[PDB]
Amino acid sequence: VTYPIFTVRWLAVHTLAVPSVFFVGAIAAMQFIQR
Amino acid sequence: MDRNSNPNRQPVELNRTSLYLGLLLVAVLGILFSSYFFN
Amino acid sequence: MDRNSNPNRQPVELNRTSLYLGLLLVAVLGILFSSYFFN
Amino acid sequence: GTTGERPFSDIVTSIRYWVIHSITIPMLFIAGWLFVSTGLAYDAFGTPRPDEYFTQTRQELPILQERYDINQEIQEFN
Amino acid sequence: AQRTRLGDILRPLNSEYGKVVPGWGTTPVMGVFMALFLVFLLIILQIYNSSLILEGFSVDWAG
Amino acid sequence: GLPWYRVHTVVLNDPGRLISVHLMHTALVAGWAGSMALYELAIFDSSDAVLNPMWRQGMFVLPFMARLGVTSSWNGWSVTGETGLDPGFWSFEGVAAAHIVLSGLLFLAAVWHWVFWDLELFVDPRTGESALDLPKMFGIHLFLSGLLCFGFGAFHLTGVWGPGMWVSDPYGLTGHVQPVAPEWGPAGFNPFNPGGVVAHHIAAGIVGIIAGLFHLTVRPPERLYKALRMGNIETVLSSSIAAVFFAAFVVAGTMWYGNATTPIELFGPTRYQWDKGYFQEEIQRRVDSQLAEGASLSEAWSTIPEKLAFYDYVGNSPAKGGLFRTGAMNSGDGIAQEWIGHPIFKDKEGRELEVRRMPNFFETFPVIMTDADGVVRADIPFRRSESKFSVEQTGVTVSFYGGALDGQTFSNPSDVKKFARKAQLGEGFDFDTETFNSDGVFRTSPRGWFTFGHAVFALLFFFGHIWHGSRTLFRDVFAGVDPGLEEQVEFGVFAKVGDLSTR
Amino acid sequence: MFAEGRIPLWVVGVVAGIGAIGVLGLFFYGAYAGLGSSM
Amino acid sequence: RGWFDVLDDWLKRDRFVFIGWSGLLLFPCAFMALGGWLTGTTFVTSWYTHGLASSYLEGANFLTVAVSSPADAFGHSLLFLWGPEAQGNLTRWFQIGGLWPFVALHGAFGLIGFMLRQFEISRLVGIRPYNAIAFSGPIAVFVSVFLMYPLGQSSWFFAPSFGVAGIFRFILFLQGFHNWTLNPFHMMGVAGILGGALLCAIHGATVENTLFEDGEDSNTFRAFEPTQAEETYSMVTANRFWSQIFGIAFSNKRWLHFFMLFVPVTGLWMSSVGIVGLALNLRAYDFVSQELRAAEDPEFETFYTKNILLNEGMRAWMAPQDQPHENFIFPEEVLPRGNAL
Amino acid sequence: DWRVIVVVSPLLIAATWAAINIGAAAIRQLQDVL
Amino acid sequence: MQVNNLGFIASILFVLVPTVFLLILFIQTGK
Amino acid sequence: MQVNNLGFIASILFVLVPTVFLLILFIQTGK
Amino acid sequence: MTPSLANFLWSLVLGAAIVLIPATVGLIFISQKDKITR
Amino acid sequence: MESVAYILVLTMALAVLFFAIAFREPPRIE
Amino acid sequence: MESVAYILVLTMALAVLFFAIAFREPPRIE
Ligand code: CLA
Ligand code: CLA
Ligand code: CLA
Ligand SMILES: CCCCCCCCCCCCCCCC(=O)OC[C@H](CO[C@@H]1O[C@H](CS(=O)(=O)O)[C@@H](O)[C@H](O)[C@H]1O)OC(=O)CCCCCCCCCCCCCCC
Ligand SMILES: CCCCCCCCCCCCCCCC(=O)OC[C@H](COP(=O)(O)OC[C@@H](O)CO)OC(=O)CCCCCCCCCCCCCCC
Ligand SMILES: CC1=C(/C=C/C(C)=C/C=C/C(C)=C/C=C/C=C(C)/C=C/C=C(C)/C=C/C2=C(C)CCCC2(C)C)C(C)(C)CCC1
Ligand SMILES: CC1=C(/C=C/C(C)=C/C=C/C(C)=C/C=C/C=C(C)/C=C/C=C(C)/C=C/C2=C(C)CCCC2(C)C)C(C)(C)CCC1
Ligand SMILES: CC1=C(/C=C/C(C)=C\C=C/C(C)=C/C=C/C=C(C)/C=C/C=C(C)\C=C\C2=C(C)CCCC2(C)C)C(C)(C)CCC1
Ligand SMILES: CCCCCCCCCCCCO[C@@H]1O[C@H](CO)[C@@H](O[C@H]2O[C@H](CO)[C@@H](O)[C@H](O)[C@H]2O)[C@H](O)[C@H]1O
Ligand SMILES: [Ca+2]
């Protein structure tokens, strides 16, 4: 009970997830580019 | 100087299964490489 | 039928002197006959 | 068997995680969106837009041939 | 353990087995020399690679 | 008993027999060197250093003798093309015989050390069993290597007392052994400057002498001694294998890319010289200078040495061979006899055409002839019913300048096509294919074979390094893990993985 | 929901899986529209 | 407690993601390699190096994106961002293919870091380091294919591009130009990989079908306990089954699991040796005896000569597009082709 | 570039949201570990 | 077929040398 | 010299086969 | 002193300043804050 | 005559198979 | 190349001599 919030695990989680979501938003936007 | 028996000497072994495995390996390597040796 | 150990089996031996003699014989036979094998 | 950190199921079933993330996750999604949709990605990475692969004077592939002066080469390719 | 004249001569060279300096000793000095060696290796690689171009020569058979 | 793959571990704790087996290995290697040189000498063709140099004859160890100054035979010839020189004892034959006698003496020493394995020099006097002071041995051997490196640089390579080394012009036409002065500036790090090699050996030998002195006098930190298992000879094996595969990668790379220590007169040209048309560019510049004087096409092209044109032929690229295309390059295209001269292709309209040369990648390549501004004006069509650019329709003719065909012009389309196919390979040469029963497919040069062998061996020595480093660091569990080992591995019980004192 | 103060983990799973299916559907839709669609 | 040991304690703590000293090399380098690859496949083109679109931004898909190899004009330049080519210009660095060496080099050092991690964790938990020894196989493959092959060739351009279709291109290129299928070292690699898959399947199935009745459920998964001392399946029954089905069987569990390691790892190593050969164009391209016989006897045809013809066709048709820096111009009439096709 | 501003502002919004909803406990944790 | 003239001897030795190595080791085992 | 093309292989086997016979027998002796 | 020389030395400096010794500083600082209790 | 060499190696492999099956080391429980 | 075969057999004979002398079975009285 009452665990630390921020950890090495938190950082490993975000280091991946955060750019992943940004990239997914970018690729979603790509889906509606017209030539 | 004297010639003293070396106490570091140990027997070597190759069991029958190891014999079959090695013989098959050698035979299949020969099968593989003979064509290239002949070219 | 059953597989019974054969009691007629005996060890074979070649002493070191016999090894040297046989190796010399083989080497000198090779020396002798190689020229004729090549012709 | 826990090395100390809060279990993931606990965290992602909590109200506070979702109050934080129902904002943070869509914000990153739409930041990536805007990065693409404003044209920023093209300029940041030098990637051609669909109308800039060829120009009214270069109809062929702009293959680099120069060993050290690629900035000038790229600018002449346009 | 047969003794020989050459063995006796060489004996002081093979007598300090296992003796060490307590703690870290010269490890910092070693590390600094390792860093210098790594820099040197990078320099000569980049020269050979033509990623580091110096004045006075060319990496070419003509020199 | 011992599995087969572990037999040699019997000398692991027997310094006398370890020395013995090292002596036997050294004897075998020295005997190989001697016998290989003798074999190469027994088959080397010395008559034509121009179109049949050593690297066309599959000569592997001969270039290494010549690199360091052994370039003449007892039999009168020298690899520099000269005759009647007197090398003294240190000819190819003398060097090979030296290695044979050395092999014998090393064999005898190995036998002695095998039989008389139990010398008191090897036993720890403090306790009573065999022990080697590995840090001290390192200091000794490093001091010795530094001495030898410095001497090689300062006396042999400089010619202060010694022959010097092979140096050559950038186009491999005037290579010979001379003293070399060290280059102490940045240019010493130009891999194509031999003065760099000389300066390296002088400076690195001094550094090795100083480091050996330090290692002869300062004991390891206790931290380092435990971490690197400095009482375990297998740690030396691991780090030595690492250093060795590092060196092997380096030598394979310098052989493949070329440098001062891998001259083309000894090992042949590189693939990159063909790639960039290095010799083609040089030949063309020489011809253009002759023309700038006023010389005619025939005269200008007849000024080009046959050796230079021979470098400009794809069959001499090391990147054209095959793994199972064995032997000398002469076993491929044949023994080169003479340059046929430079062809110039002109079509019916006066346009002069360039045949596109075969790249290194291509086992086969279409014949294409382009004009000055890079437009195909002729080719050899595969399909003929819609052919438009064939040599027959385009009226392509070829005229030769210099060489055997100097002044000859061919208009018969068969002749033109065969010569276009010849020009695809670079400069054309007549070949003797009867001596070797040459088969027609290209071989690689000693440069290629050396690079291949050493890259493969370096790769495998990486695994050797990993295996022996792991055996060094995990010696305690080599026969298996502790029959306990319950809670130490359990997750979350200890604050630090493995450390029982932590929780 | 069925318990106060927390989201059921299966509700979270269903929502996240629907979102993942949606992003995959958007990518597959984009294979047929806009750039890369052969039209 | 010296600062070194305090650091060692912190690095080796039991947490969700073990860090270790090896993590100092692994995690930043692995992150660089992975983020570089994702960034390149999402945003970065190969228009100037290959004349190809290679990113999602240009309309490519998962199968057709890649971090493509750099332009052939750079030879084996390491293409640092601050290097003489890009000169610190990030956009140009992207456009010239700087991401390829970026990913390759950080991946090589991340692979090193991962194997060091295997060693470190094996040492900490107290087991033998055979996992690292097994991982040496993938390392040999990566070094030989992504570093050694292009270093033997003219430039990084001929390295495999980090993309699915880029890899397929590399594969077909090696067939057409090197006849890699004919290479005995590739053949040993194939044998190792197929044998490893076979061993995996057969061992898993054998174990699952010789399980002991240790529970009452039809679900046999819950009749195992990791601390149990006894074998969970019958080695004796397995051995009898395979002896009567196949003629031979494993009788030694330790040998079985060592063999499962040895086969795929040996395969990877042998194929790496073959790739080193191909780096220098030292191919097993041809059988000279059959070539000569065919050149003299126009009725002699084998599957080998047919494959040679296929390779010729592939080279002629693919080279102009695959090597755009060469400016290969092959007029239609020089292209080899069969009748009616 | 205004495009940079509009691409960064969502990131800052997410950061400040997370801060304002986690800061008390984060500072608690920072202080406890000293 | 015009094959490499060393093919037969190379193949024979490639097989025979390791064959005899294994045979020796196997036969002497238990000594 | 144009020698019999079987000369090398015949000589090698003529020596090697009895050599390995003797070697096997010697090495296993005492088993 | 060439541009490539200057950039090489800058690369050394910026690799240290950006990677080597903010990372060493952070590692030392955190190891000395969160200390294992024996 | 290379055909003889190919047949020889193939026969060696098959003979090894037959002996490894017929004359194997028995697995024994003890 | 037949010279190599002659040299090989001669060397084998001489090597056998050296081992038969140096590494002989000692005659022992017992
Ligand atoms: C005095 C003894 C002696 C002399 C004069 C020679 C001379 C020669 N040998 Mg030879 N050889 C010898 C002993 C000798 N050998 C012994 C004992 C062996 C058995 C191991 C051999 C095995 C041998 C082979 C296999 C070959 C030769 C060859 C040659 C010829 C070329 C050598 C060459 O390229 O060097 C190359 C040597 C190096 C590049 C040295 C590499 C050492 C590395 C760079 C240093 C290692 C790291 C260092 C120790 C650590 C740092 C220290 C530093 C700070 C100072 C040359 C005529 C070649 C030949 O032409 O055949 C006929 C050949 O292929 N020799
Ligand atoms: C690295 C060392 C090296 C290098 C670079 C060379 C290079 C060369 N040698 Mg050689 N040679 C060497 C060592 C070396 N040699 C040794 C140690 C010997 C003593 C046997 C010889 C004796 C020798 C002779 C008699 C001749 C040469 C010749 C030549 C030239 C022709 C090369 C050739 O066709 O080979 C061909 C290479 C191959 C066919 C590659 C074979 C690859 C094998 C089959 C791989 C083995 C697979 C393995 C079993 C897999 C294991 C399975 C796994 C489960 C572990 C060439 C320049 C020839 C020459 O032209 O002389 C003037 C020649 O006549 N050499
Ligand atoms: C200086 C180099 C060197 C040295 C001194 C050693 C020494 C040793 N190794 Mg090692 N190793 C090396 C490099 C080296 N290795 C490399 C490069 C690799 C990767 C290929 C390995 C991988 C390796 C493994 C997996 C093992 C060893 C083992 C051993 C120990 C027992 C060796 C033995 O009896 O096998 C005897 C070998 C035979 C009876 C037959 C081998 C036949 C080979 C395959 C072909 C021979 C070709 C030819 C004669 C050699 C020329 C190659 C040369 C040019 C390098 C021994 C201390 C063993 C060990 O750790 O024991 C506990 C062990 O299991 N090594
Ligand atoms: C991106 C990831 C980057 C990874 C970074 C990893 C973090 C740093 C890891 C450092 C590992 C090496 C340190 C080993 C410990 C040590 O040797 O002794 C620890 C010593 C002994 O101190 C004192 O010594 C006392 C006595 S004794 O001598 O040590 O026994 C002892 O009691 C006491 O404990 C101790 O305080 O402490 C130090 O102050 C010496 C520091 C020397 C470290 C090597 C520096 C070389 C690197 C610089 C590179 C640039 C050089 C210039 C290049 C141009
Ligand atoms: C239907 C019944 C008829 C079977 C006919 C099919 C033959 C298959 C018999 C297996 C052959 C024995 C080979 C291993 C020799 C042998 O006897 O091994 C016996 C061995 C038994 O191992 P143990 O566990 O008893 O050994 C442990 C210790 O002894 C370690 O040595 O089995 C294995 O090692 C399995 C791994 C190799 C599996 C090899 C399969 C190879 C397939 C065939 C390849 C050659 C084809 C070439 C064609 C030209
Ligand atoms: C006793 C004596 C003597 C004599 C000596 C002699 C005469 C010698 C020799 C020697 C020799 C003459 C040697 C040798 C050697 C060789 C070697 C050592 C080799 C090898 C091999 C190898 C190792 C190879 C391998 C391989 C193969 C097989 C295939 C390919 C790949 C490879 C390369 C891996 C004298 C009187 C002087 C003195 C006294 C004592
Ligand atoms: C480049 C570079 C760099 C780096 C960067 C980085 C490191 C980054 C990154 C990055 C990243 C890291 C990104 C990411 C991403 C991602 C993504 C793009 C994702 C995805 C996905 C998906 C699509 C999935 C899907 C799925 C499936 C399929 C299965 C099931 C379901 C799911 C949904 C899960 C720097 C700046 C240093 C410098 C310069 C260069
Ligand atoms: C697997 C998995 C998962 C996920 C899941 C998901 C993500 C989902 C789902 C699902 C869904 C999302 C669903 C649904 C449904 C619906 C339905 C089933 C319906 C219906 C109906 C109908 C039948 C209709 C009808 C109609 C018609 C006929 C016409 C008229 C109108 C209407 C519309 C009415 C979890 C994590 C949980 C767990 C683990 C894994
Ligand atoms: C673990 C090791 C990690 C290695 C990688 C770490 C990242 C390395 C980044 C180093 C980047 C070097 O980046 C380099 O910086 C220098 C110095 O600012 C820039 O240099 C710029 O500013 C300097 C001084 O202000 C001027 O002299 C120069 O003319 C100008 O270009 C270069 O244009 C850029 O190429
Ligand atoms: Ca028609």
Side-chain angles (χ1 to χ4, degrees), chain B residues 15 17-18 20-21 24 28 31, chain H residues 245-252 255 259, chain M residues 10 13-14 17 20-21:
Chain B
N15 61 41
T17 293
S18 292
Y20 292 143
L21 287 159
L24 186 55
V28 302
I31 292 164
Chain H
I245 286 301
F246 193 52
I248 72 97
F250 284 105
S251 67
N252 188 300
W255 169 241
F259 198 61
Chain M
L10 291 161
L14 301 175
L17 299 205
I21 296 176

Side-chain angles (χ1 to χ4, degrees), chain G residues 10 13-18 21:
Chain G
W10 74 270
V14 168
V15 169
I18 270 165
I21 283 157

Side-chain angles (χ1 to χ4, degrees), chain E residues 11 14 17 19 21 24 58, chain F residues 120-121 126 190 219 222:
Chain E
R11 163 95 281 167
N14 191 44
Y17 163 73
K19 159 192 329 186
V21 173
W24 285 99
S58 56
Chain F
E120 131 349 22
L121 173 65
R126 272 193 326 270
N190 178 6
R219 298 296 302 177
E222 171 174 52

